[PDB]
Amino acid sequence: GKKKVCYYYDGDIGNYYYGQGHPMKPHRIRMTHNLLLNYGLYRKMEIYRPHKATAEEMTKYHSDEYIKFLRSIRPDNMSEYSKQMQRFNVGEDCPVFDGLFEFCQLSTGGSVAGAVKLNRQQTDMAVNWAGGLHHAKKSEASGFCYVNDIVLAILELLKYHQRVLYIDIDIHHGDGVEEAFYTTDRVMTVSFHKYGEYFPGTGDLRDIGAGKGKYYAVNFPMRDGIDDESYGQIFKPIISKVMEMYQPSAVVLQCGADSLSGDRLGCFNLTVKGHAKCVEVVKTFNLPLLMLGGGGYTIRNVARCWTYETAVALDCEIPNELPYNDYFEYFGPDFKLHISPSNMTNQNTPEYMEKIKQRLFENLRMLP
């Protein structure tokens, strides 16, 4: 039936700024929050302001040296850290900005807090749109990500769940999460992403895990222009097979919105309905579920996507006509919630989609 939803947000998150021209805009989280508030979605969920995750909480995954670096570096002292900046990949993509550490603490706090709430059986779903920073590694920032809130949240879920399923619908391969759990069967990672001359370069169909983790990493490589139809040919059949074989007791779903049509950095052609159908499919299994954010660079579409996915989590129908809100002008010229796909060519033929699905089904037959 209808599920209980806990939503994590800190009103300060929208004030963090990556710098002039940087495509990552934390303000998109504030736009999402304001839109879902104006739709009245606050009357149906418990809203929490997560704590600032401590350096000690972050070192459950990250190295002590890397976390100490993040907690020490500032724009005014950067010149003294040129050596560590190179070592930790802090530079162009992952710049030093005012409040960087606090931004990491809030993004991480929401994911860990949601995982604790699910562990305590006090909610069916927990949502942290400021999380989903799948590219961060043990001792390295990457792809606009510094602290891997997902890995930390999964480590929290593993305290009470034998098997945790991680699903990632961001356009980019979920590399940091896949690497963290590559040699264990206690987490299955499933990533659907653009593959081929594309960041971060990993996520080949043939990357299936190693040691005890062999067959517990699943990668669905895609070409430009995937549409709702192509994604629909494979998402439910693959997730259904994974649920059947793996039988997880908790699920983490990364909902990166850079897989939407019209994204500034992405090259996919999903609509908000197509992207949200993934949330509907996963939610249907009725398992404890942590929903996280991720990429997304056409910020009016990110706000639409995550507002609609919050309504999907709540089983709440909302009108296509947008309510008035603090960012109303960003949603012109139509002022509607849903988006139309572009005319871009879908390079993922129906035959290619079925063929990759069949190769993944062969690997899933290898689970015990």
Ligand SMILES: O=C(N[C@@H](CCCCNC(=O)c1c(O)cccc1F)c1ncc(-c2ccc3ccccc3c2)[nH]1)c1cncs1
């Ligand atoms: O291609 C490389 N970088 C990629 C990284 C894209 C990472 C995407 N991350 C997410 O989508 C993501 C996610 O999936 C989940 C959670 C959070 C996330 F952020 C890149 N695309 C564009 C730029 C860009 C453009 C303009 C700039 C202007 C000012 C300063 C820096 C700018 C950076 N950077 C390379 C690096 N080193 C060698 S090649």
Ligand SMILES: [Ca+2]
């Ligand atoms: Ca992905």
Ligand SMILES: [Ca+2]
């Ligand atoms: Ca694994």
Ligand SMILES: [Zn+2]
């Ligand atoms: Zn991304």
